[PDB]
Amino acid sequence: KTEKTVKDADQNIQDAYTYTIKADAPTWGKDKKLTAFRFEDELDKRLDFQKVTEVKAGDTVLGTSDYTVNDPATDGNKLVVTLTDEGLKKVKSGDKMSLTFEVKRKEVGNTTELKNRADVIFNNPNTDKEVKNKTNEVVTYHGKLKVVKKDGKEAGKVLKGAEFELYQCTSAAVLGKGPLTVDGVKKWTTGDDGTFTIDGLHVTDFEDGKEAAPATKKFCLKETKAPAGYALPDPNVTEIEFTRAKISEKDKFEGDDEVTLVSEIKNIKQGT
Ligand SMILES: [Ca+2]
């Protein structure tokens, strides 16, 4: 069957991840040859194609002379991987074709979901007819994380200058991997409105194209520096339940839209 898979677990915005397209080549006798075979994939506009990592015909790993790659940036983000005449010679009747390529998601954009589907288009050597087989659709979800720094007492007082790191964690008491780099940044500071937004993070409840198995996967914000005149909170680690359903909630805080999770973190004035 014609199948698409995505390997994206824990890959945030601007982290490389991969798609794989698998399809059966047609069958043909010794008196014929495969005259055309290509993969096509309309990449979501939020993706930046990086490179093809592998093209295989059965167990044969193809080389760059065996296929051509277009430039998705100049073809409306459509990727086309076409077997050359040398590449078509390496294809055996009924071979399982495979294409793996790498992308980066540039931003969350207007939906947490980012879908992908592909087509395999070839000439059937038995009839010389063009055949087009579409894959299933796979989905990758990312959301924005907005942090709003406030004074624990004085309601409505937002605080500039608070500094934070981000970690993977099982809980706020047990930090995992980090400080994480997200789109070249590994430390964020609250601005004049007491906020910053991390655009963006991989959701925890869905990964590699399917629902995640029940697990205690979370993100944690570590406040490393409090605003001037404020004591560093204890605890200074805030855990975030960064799921599709939690992100989708809206109008609970300023800037709380369906693609952003808003986390309000309190600080007590130095000397209480
Ligand atoms: Ca929201």
Side-chain angles (χ1 to χ4, degrees):
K1 76 151 184 179
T2 319
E3 188 172 7
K4 184 168 175 166
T5 55
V6 59
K7 191 80 186 58
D8 58 34
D10 303 310
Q11 302 316 302
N12 298 312
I13 290 311
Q14 288 293 359
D15 290 330
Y17 71 89
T18 60
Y19 291 115
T20 292
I21 304 152
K22 292 198 191 289
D24 297 304
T27 57
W28 65 92
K30 278 275 188 293
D31 59 319
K32 286 158 190 293
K33 57 178 175 69
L34 182 62
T35 65
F37 193 99
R38 73 188 189 263
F39 310 81
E40 283 193 6
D41 193 320
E42 293 179 70
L43 300 175
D44 182 288
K45 294 297 270 179
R46 293 168 290 183
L47 297 175
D48 284 329
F49 168 75
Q50 304 302 113
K51 62 172 178 279
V52 168
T53 63
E54 179 184 79
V55 185
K56 272 180 100 173
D59 288 304
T60 310
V61 174
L62 298 196
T64 64
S65 291
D66 296 324
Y67 61 88
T68 66
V69 193
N70 72 333
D71 180 22
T74 65
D75 210 358
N77 231 26
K78 187 172 96 166
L79 174 67
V80 184
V81 180
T82 309
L83 305 192
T84 63
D85 288 337
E86 291 155 21
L88 294 161
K89 284 184 196 77
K90 296 189 185 174
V91 185
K92 313 283 161 248
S93 166
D95 264 353
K96 173 60 83 182
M97 307 302 300
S98 188
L99 163 69
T100 299
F101 65 95
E102 185 189 289
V103 295
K104 292 177 184 178
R105 184 179 176 159
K106 303 180 260 181
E107 62 175 333
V108 166
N110 290 337
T111 60
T112 58
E113 71 172 2
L114 185 155
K115 301 181 290 198
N116 186 65
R117 200 193 293 269
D119 317 294
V120 307
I121 308 158
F122 58 86
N123 289 345
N124 191 308
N126 307 280
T127 68
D128 286 302
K129 291 167 168 284
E130 195 173 68
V131 174
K132 181 208 204 88
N133 294 325
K134 303 178 109 80
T135 66
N136 53 295
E137 192 161 67
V138 292
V139 191
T140 302
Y141 298 84
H142 288 82
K144 295 196 234 171
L145 175 61
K146 176 182 178 167
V147 172
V148 43
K149 192 70 179 52
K150 287 187 167 172
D151 182 324
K153 184 73 219 178
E154 211 163 338
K157 195 172 186 263
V158 293
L159 311 172
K160 176 194 187 180
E163 291 172 6
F164 288 84
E165 289 176 330
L166 182 74
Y167 290 83
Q168 293 170 7
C169 63
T170 47
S171 86
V174 193
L175 294 181
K177 192 182 280 186
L180 296 178
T181 297
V182 184
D183 193 355
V185 177
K186 67 172 183 191
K187 188 169 280 188
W188 296 263
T189 307
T190 60
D192 297 307
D193 64 357
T195 83
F196 63 80
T197 298
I198 307 174
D199 183 351
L201 307 173
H202 197 297
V203 307
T204 61
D205 62 311
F206 195 98
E207 73 203 351
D208 301 340
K210 69 195 184 301
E211 302 276 342
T216 52
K217 179 130 103 175
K218 289 160 163 263
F219 284 107
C220 276
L221 290 156
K222 185 186 187 178
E223 191 181 336
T224 53
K225 189 188 93 64
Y230 288 79
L232 192 70
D234 186 16
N236 69 324
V237 175
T238 299
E239 66 178 26
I240 302 295
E241 306 207 356
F242 206 69
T243 68
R244 288 175 297 165
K246 287 278 179 70
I247 294 164
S248 182
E249 288 196 75
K250 47 185 185 75
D251 295 313
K252 307 302 180 178
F253 309 90
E254 184 186 359
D256 186 17
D257 62 27
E258 68 270 32
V259 301
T260 313
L261 190 142
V262 178
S263 180
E264 290 197 338
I265 298 167
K266 315 272 187 196
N267 291 264
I268 288 140
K269 276 185 193 80
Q270 197 88 70
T272 212

